């Protein structure tokens, strides 16, 4: 019994984390087979970041301009190319600990685990959600660029690589194909994080987790229509619950016996009259950073 912010085990990814230095600039890289993937701003300098031309900068770089270290062991760069905001460094040795992997782009609202790394050494692992405005509320210090996010399906799904911190203390990054989540750019310019909303399907999944764990005070007798629920939800800056969200809650409704619209009604109550100083699962706010899948894993 119990419920906790639970990350995937990190061991498969720890063995892929290397250090990548380009002159003065250092960050982490992902070492898969005989390629190392890292944020392409490693080839810049602080002066460049204002308006940088990455195309030329890469031309003037040569393989020797890149120092890759995996542990004490140096890796030799024998080629370099650029895919969107991600740099791909070809190396002589294939990573012996390469796991079965695949590059996925995640939808906003889905969660992943983040392995925070410094100078290619892992420091910790935590869970994160892709907010609806395509930012994540991570925990990153100077030198963590190139940390990655993943899910495990024994196949690792890499889905996030860290690039910058927005002014609100919130982070932005790319997928392993180099494309930024959201509208952000690896150049020094004014970049706003949009107005955020709450991930409805996740708050629901969380309430199911509460019921499974014996916390059911908030269950009511009423029901609602999906459309009438969305009318109340949007008023509270909640994401509109979709038919595809409804199917995904399926396992949780089956396990508890509580249908989805039953729970939507219980949530409507909480949204209107608040909690009245009570805790659902020891938390006094509503939690929206657990996907339905996440609940199924911990309550299987």
């Amino acid at each position: 019994s119990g419920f906790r912010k639970m990350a995937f085990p990190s061991g498969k990814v720890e063995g892929c984390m290397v250090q990548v230095t380009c002159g003065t600039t250092t960050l982490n890289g992902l070492w898969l087979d005989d390629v190392v993937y890292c944020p392409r701003h490693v080839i810049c300098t602080s002066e460049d970041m204002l308006n940088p031309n990455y195309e030329d900068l890469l031309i003037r770089k040569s393989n020797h301009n890149f120092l890759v270290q995996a542990g004490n062991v140096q890796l030799r760069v024998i080629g370099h190319s650029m895919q969107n905001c991600v740099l791909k460094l070809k190396v002589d040795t294939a990573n012996p600990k390469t796991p079965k992997y695949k590059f996925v782009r995640i939808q906003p609202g889905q969660t992943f685990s983040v392995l925070a790394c410094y100078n290619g050494s892992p420091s910790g692992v935590y869970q994160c959600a892709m907010r609806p405005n395509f930012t994540i509320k991570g925990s990153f210090l100077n030198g963590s660029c190139g940390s990655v996010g993943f899910n495990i399906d024994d196949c690792v799904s890499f889905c996030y690589m860290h690039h910058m911190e927005l002014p609100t203390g919130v982070h932005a990054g790319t997928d392993l194909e180099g494309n930024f989540y959201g509208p952000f750019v690896d150049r020094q310019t004014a970049q706003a994080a949009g107005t955020d909303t709450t991930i409805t399907v996740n708050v629901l999944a969380w309430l199911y987790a509460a019921v499974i764990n014996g916390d059911r005070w908030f269950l009511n007798r009423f029901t609602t229509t999906l459309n009438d629920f969305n009318l109340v939800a949007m008023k509270y800056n909640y994401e509109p619950l979709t038919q595809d969200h409804v199917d995904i809650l399926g396992p949780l409704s089956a396990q508890t016996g509580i249908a989805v619209l039953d729970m939507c009604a219980s949530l409507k109550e909480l949204l209107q009259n608040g909690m009245n100083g009570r805790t659902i699962l020891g938390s006094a706010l509503l939690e929206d950073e657990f996907t339905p899948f996440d609940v199924v894993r911990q309550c299987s």
Binding site: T25, H41, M49, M164, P167
Partner: peptide, 15 residues
């Protein structure tokens, strides 16, 4: 501005 979490960080032009 934004901050890039190199190193070594690209900061705040800002100043």
């Amino acid at each position: 501005x934004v901050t890039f979490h190199t190193x070594x960080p690209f900061l705040x032009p800002x100043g």
